[PDB]
Amino acid sequence: PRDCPQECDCPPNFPTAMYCDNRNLKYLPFVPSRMKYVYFQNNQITSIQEGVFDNATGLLWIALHGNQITSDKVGRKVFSKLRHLERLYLDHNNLTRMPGPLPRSLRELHLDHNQISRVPNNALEGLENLTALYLQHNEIQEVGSSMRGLRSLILLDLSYNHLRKVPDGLPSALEQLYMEHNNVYTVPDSYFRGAPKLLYVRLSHNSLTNNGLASNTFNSSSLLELDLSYNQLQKIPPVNTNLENLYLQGNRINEFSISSFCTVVDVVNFSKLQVLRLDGNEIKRSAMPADAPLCLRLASLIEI
Length: 304
Ligand SMILES: *[C@@H]1O[C@H](CO[C@@H]2O[C@@H](C)[C@@H](O)[C@@H](O)[C@@H]2O)[C@@H](O[C@@H]2O[C@H](CO)[C@@H](O[C@@H]3O[C@H](CO)[C@@H](O)[C@H](O)[C@@H]3O)[C@H](O)[C@H]2NC(C)=O)[C@H](O)[C@H]1NC(C)=O
Ligand SMILES: *[C@@H]1O[C@H](CO[C@@H]2O[C@@H](C)[C@@H](O)[C@@H](O)[C@@H]2O)[C@@H](O[C@@H]2O[C@H](CO)[C@@H](O[C@@H]3O[C@H](CO)[C@@H](O)[C@H](O)[C@@H]3O)[C@H](O)[C@H]2NC(C)=O)[C@H](O)[C@H]1NC(C)=O
Ligand SMILES: *[C@@H]1O[C@H](CO[C@@H]2O[C@@H](C)[C@@H](O)[C@@H](O)[C@@H]2O)[C@@H](O[C@@H]2O[C@H](CO)[C@@H](O[C@@H]3O[C@H](CO)[C@@H](O)[C@H](O)[C@@H]3O)[C@H](O)[C@H]2NC(C)=O)[C@H](O)[C@H]1NC(C)=O
Ligand SMILES: *[C@@H]1O[C@H](CO[C@@H]2O[C@@H](C)[C@@H](O)[C@@H](O)[C@@H]2O)[C@@H](O[C@@H]2O[C@H](CO)[C@@H](O[C@@H]3O[C@H](CO)[C@@H](O)[C@H](O)[C@@H]3O)[C@H](O)[C@H]2NC(C)=O)[C@H](O)[C@H]1NC(C)=O
Ligand SMILES: [Cl-]
Ligand code: NI
Fold this sequence. Notes:
binds nickel (II) ion; mainly beta; binds chloride ion; binds a molecule of 4 linked components (NAG-NAG-BMA-FUC)
């Protein structure tokens, strides 16, 4: 049992892999039953025909990035019988909608550099082993509640999109969240309290104003780095003493309030901030009081 499409290469030393990448292919051949790894990247494929993977029920990897696939030419239920699929690469195509339904066994999903306009609420239903989701460089306007059920998700990249609203609910294991270069103008009260293990957040180049925030929005005990540069902030939003890096350059901040870092300062209460950028705002260095180091006791680099 070693049949192989003529346009592809199947190594004898590794009979469960099939290489069809970078060959000017125009369509997908039907995959042999034994295959676990298939590589179709960097061709001129335009469609994923119905039933293409139905013989290979043991597929783990599918690489389809770097083609010209459109959403109307993704076959019906084409991924449905692949109940062990772990990794799927669909970045750099011509997709306008989320493909699906997707197998509940997925661990990584790449969908960046397409033209996806929206993530419906049920688009990622049941993917409880998904650890990384790449969606940057699309035209997404909203994702709704699609992220709530992803119990294993560590990384979510939504940067360089058209987001008007932050995701309505975050999963509990999330550590990295990137949403820079979007159109966010509001963030709700206690938004990050639902993500106990969140470490890195980027929200630069959006349309944030203090009136669109709550007092405690960015006060979270888990955060290490927070990037909010080039918004339209007039005041330093309050933060937790655990925060280590804060970027606020290119805003409209017109006062230095020490109470944004520490509500009370004593021998054991103080900010652990190491890096702080406040340059490109409406304050001079003299706006920072002489006794500021009592609060910012660890600040090694402060730019104003
Ligand atoms: C996709 O899969 C089909 C069917 O797979 C068959 O059913 C599965 C449940 C497994 O048990 C497979 O092992 C099994 O093959 C493949 O078609 C099948 O091809 C084989 C040839 O290797 C056919 O067997 C032969 O059939 C002739 C005619 O009856 C006999 O004279 C021979 O003695 C021998 O038995 C088998 O009949 C055929 N099955 C069907 C339903 O047509 C198909 O090749 C495969 N495609 C790829 C690309 O892998
Ligand atoms: C899949 O998408 C590619 C790329 O689409 C490009 O990026 C998008 C974000 C939009 O901005 C699109 O407007 C943009 O094209 C498509 O490739 C594109 O094909 C068209 C023709 O089909 C190309 O236009 C030509 O451009 C040359 C100059 O190089 C002119 O001389 C021609 O007269 C003609 O106008 C376009 O340049 C090309 N873009 C890229 C980046 O290669 C692709 O067609 C599409 N595939 C499907 C199946 O929809
Ligand atoms: C979500 O993922 C879990 C667990 O995945 C596991 O953990 C990873 C870190 C890796 O180590 C993976 O290799 C590993 O599978 C899935 O649960 C697992 O399901 C498989 C069935 O496909 C179970 O296989 C069994 O394993 C036992 C040995 O304990 C054998 O005796 C059996 O014959 C059978 O092969 C596996 O045990 C099970 N693991 C756990 C920890 O539950 C889960 O299926 C997956 N979710 C979805 C929807 O696919
Ligand atoms: C950032 O957030 C911390 C902690 O926030 C606490 O936990 C959240 C989940 C919410 O439930 C908050 O409501 C809650 O306060 C803030 O630290 C907290 O500051 C308050 C002062 O407003 C402390 O409360 C006071 O404590 C004294 C002495 O115990 C009492 O006498 C007072 O009556 C009053 O209750 C609170 O103890 C303190 N918590 C911790 C864990 O340190 C922090 O102020 C905030 N930062 C900014 C800039 O707003
Ligand atoms: Cl980039
Ligand atoms: Ni880019």
